[PDB]
RNA sequence: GGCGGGCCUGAGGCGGCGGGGGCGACGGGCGGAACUUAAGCAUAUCAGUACGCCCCGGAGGAGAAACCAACCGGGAUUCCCC
């Protein structure tokens, strides 16, 4: 999710901030751009059941 | 899964209603010392203490006695634990026969568990 | 080590598989080997095993033996089995 | 004329060259023995000998298959195919008869796909002493036998009525046909200059 | 065209190699594959055994 | 007592008969192609052992593998990259050559399904193997009860696959008991099994 | 040299039948990385992974000991817990 897309960072001295980026320029691959991978993924691999003896 | 394998238990279980889903298996020493004393289910019986029994190695498998001619009967006293297993077997079968007699067949107590724990 | 110590190893009797009937090359298959050998003949590497017999004794031949089969225990018995067609010519 | 310069296709070319480089090379003993056979007129009086005994015909098997095994229903015996002496071939019957003793002329063939085959025949023979003769083509012996080819046919116990002459044939072959001798040959290579 | 399918289904019926349309569809696998009866055929040796000791049924309290 | 006899002829490879049929042998498939069509299995007896019977459906096929150390192919011979990784000339191929011959006579001839190879010839240049194939789709095989369980599409381009005799061998299957425990199903396979992280939920 | 037959290695044509390509998983065989980690880097490591290639199945692979064990011993493979 968020990942599929493709962005290579634009970087500093070309005046945009530096976040990776589409052919255009658009936010992408980050927490706080639209449509980036939330930056720490929610997870199936957590302790669902708590055990009792 | 544990209900899948359930319910698929139970449907060996009418494909074949007399016989129990799992077969007889012998007594054998566990191995290495700090097992010695306990006993456990065998891969088979052995030949020879399948012939103690005066059954041929067919004849042991169809009536549901496995036998494998891997094992080697080794101690004396691994013959006792297993011969005395067949017989406790032998004598608690019953073998249906005359074609197939309905009535009979239908009252039949299938053993669910390993048999002869 | 390998071994458990129990003074008194031994509580349940024990039948000791052996021999299977031992068997032996039995009479054909001698015979089959004596059947080809007349026909082709001994292999190089063998040959000069038994050249180095008639004049060295040993040694030198056990050591070529050694590095055409690989395994001493195949080599004495290689150096041995050739032997007998040494002491004839 | 313009015949000797024809480049022949590669298979004909290859399987020439084959003859040419075998006949040139050392060619050990035992593999002498096969090149060079017994002479044709020995052959015919064996295979004049072959013919008077052989197998049924295909036609004949045919004709067992229709009668003798499809109305069986009408009557009820198995074997009232041939019992009379006949002539085996094929190298497990024939080792398995010439190891037994019993059979008396074996008739292996000078051609042969691999000669491994029927390398170790000929000294099979002089070990348990049975006689031995090596015959032109494994084809004109399989015809012999009713086969498309069989690598060797074994004389059996034989008729008495053909013992006579069957003894005359077995010593034309003891003398033309001698295992040691031909385990002394080691071949030939004969050069461009004796053709 | 349905009058004409029947009629070439009777010109080739009963016969060995049928014109392909007229053969069952089934799918590739289904062409290809054994015949339930040739899988269950066993070596006549192997075959043997099976009738000489056959199933039965036995039950244990 | 016939069979039995040829393979003792087989046990000597180096006496002067065996030698001069096999330089008769090695010449010609030398002046021949690297996947000819064999009518006869060159050794009759190793066919059996192997499983070759001449009912029709089985084909022999003889095929010349180069003999060589791999060289691996890369632009100028450099493997651009760590330093442990640099190697073009002494490689060593990790499928022998007996299993790669097996791969080979299945490219150029897919339908059949190889079953396993006999060596037949040798020179320092070429090795040559023999590979057994048996047709699927001639009616008698499919019949056979012993050959029936090789039609079964399981059983389709086993040679690639890794199903043939030098290939169990090439994975290391040959040799089974301990010292082969990391190979038992397959090694990618084993990898798996060991390194797979579970998470017991009411552990 | 010619001619005709048998065997053997081949050459075209015919008849029937297969074979090829596809699927973002699982699966089998190879060929095969580097970024990284070691606070540098060469052995290591990432990793017997990405990716490339060929092949099959509804599971495949594996499998009835040239096997573990050393015991008052087990007994094909496959999976799972430890």
């Not at chain 1, 530096?18 to 639209?34: E, S, T």
Request: aromatic fraction near 6%; include cysteine; proline fraction near 5%.
């Amino acid at each position: 999710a968020g990942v599929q897309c493709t962005a290579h960072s634009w970087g500093p001295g070309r005046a945009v901030a530096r976040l990776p980026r589409k052919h255009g320029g658009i936010g992408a691959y980050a927490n706080f751009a639209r449509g980036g991978h939330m930056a720490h993924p929610t997870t199936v691999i957590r302790r669902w059941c708590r055990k009792v003896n | 899964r544990k209900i899948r394998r359930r319910q698929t238990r139970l449907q060996k279980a009418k494909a074949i209603f007399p016989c129990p889903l799992q077969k007889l298996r012998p007594s054998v020493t566990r191995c290495s010392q700090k097992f010695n004393l306990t006993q456990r289910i065998g891969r088979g019986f052995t030949l020879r203490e399948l012939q103690g029994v005066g059954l041929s190695a067919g004849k042991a498998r169809q009536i549901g006695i496995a036998v494998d001619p891997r094992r080697k009967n080794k101690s004396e006293e691994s013959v006792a634990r297993n011969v005395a297993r067949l017989k406790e077997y032998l004598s608690k079968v019953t073998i249906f026969s005359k074609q197939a007699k309905p009535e009979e067949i239908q009252q039949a107590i299938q053993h669910q568990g390993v048999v002869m724990p | 080590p390998g071994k458990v110590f129990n003074l008194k190893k031994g509580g349940a009797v024990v039948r000791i598989v052996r021999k299977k009937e031992e068997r032996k090359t039995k009479p054909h298959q001698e015979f089959v080997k004596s059947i080809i050998q007349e026909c082709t003949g001994m292999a190089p590497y063998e040959m000069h095993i038994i050249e180095l017999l008639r004049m060295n004794k040993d040694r030198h031949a056990l050591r070529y033996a050694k590095k055409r089969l690989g395994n001493i225990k195949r080599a004495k018995a290689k150096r041995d089995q050739l032997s007998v067609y040494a002491r004839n010519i | 004329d313009l015949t000797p310069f024809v480049r022949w296709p590669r298979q004909v070319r290859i399987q020439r060259q084959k003859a040419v480089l075998q006949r040139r090379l050392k060619v050990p003993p035992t593999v002498n023995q096969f090149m060079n056979p017994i002479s044709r007129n020995l052959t015919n009086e064996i295979f004049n000998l072959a013919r008077k005994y052989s197998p049924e015909s295909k036609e004949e098997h045919k004709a067992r298959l229709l009668q003798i095994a499809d109305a069986k229903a009408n009557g009820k015996p198995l074997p009232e195919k041939s019992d009379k002496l006949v002539i085996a071939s094929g190298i497990r019957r024939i080792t398995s008869l010439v190891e037994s003793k019993r059979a008396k002329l074996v008739l292996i063939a000078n051609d042969v796909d691999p000669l491994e085959l029927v390398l170790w025949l000929p000294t099979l023979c002089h070990k348990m002493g049975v006689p031995y003769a090596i015959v032109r083509t494994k084809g004109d012996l399989g015809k012999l036998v009713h086969l498309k080819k069989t690598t060797s046919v074994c004389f059996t116990d034989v008729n008495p009525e053909d013992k006579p002459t069957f003894d005359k044939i077995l010593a034309a072959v003891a003398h033309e046909v001698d295992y040691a001798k031909a385990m002394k040959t080691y071949g030939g290579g004969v050069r461009r200059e004796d053709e | 065209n349905q009058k004409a399918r029947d009629e070439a289904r009777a010109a080739f019926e009963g016969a060995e190699h049928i014109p392909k349309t007229f053969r069952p569809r089934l799918t590739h696998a289904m062409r290809c594959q054994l015949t339930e009866k040739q899988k269950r055929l066993l070596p006549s040796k192997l075959m043997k055994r099976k009738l000489q000791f056959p199933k039965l049924k036995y039950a244990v309290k | 007592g016939a069979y039995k006899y040829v393979q003792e002829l087989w046990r000597k490879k180096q006496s002067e008969a065996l030698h001069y049929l096999f330089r008769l042998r090695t010449w010609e498939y030398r002046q021949l192609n690297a996947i000819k069509r064999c009518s006869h299995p060159t050794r009759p007896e190793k066919a059996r052992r192997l499983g070759y019977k001449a009912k029709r459906g089985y084909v022999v096929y003889r095929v010349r593998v180069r003999r060589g150390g791999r060289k691996r192919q890369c632009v100028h011979g450099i493997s651009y990259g760590k330093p442990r990784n640099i190697g073009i000339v002494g490689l060593k191929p990790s499928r022998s050559l007996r299993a790669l011959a097996e791969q080979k006579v299945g490219r150029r001839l897919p339908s059949l399904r190889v079953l396993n190879s006999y060596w037949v010839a040798q020179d320092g240049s070429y090795k040559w193997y023999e590979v057994i194939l048996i047709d699927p789709f001639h009616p008698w095989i499919r019949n056979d009860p012993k050959i029936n369980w090789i039609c079964n599409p399981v059983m389709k381009r086993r040679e690639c696959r890794g199903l043939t005799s030098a290939g169990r061998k090439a994975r290391g299957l040959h040799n089974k008991g301990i010292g082969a425990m990391k190979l038992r199903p397959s090694k990618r396979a084993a990898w798996k099994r060991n390194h797979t992280r579970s998470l017991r939920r009411y552990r």
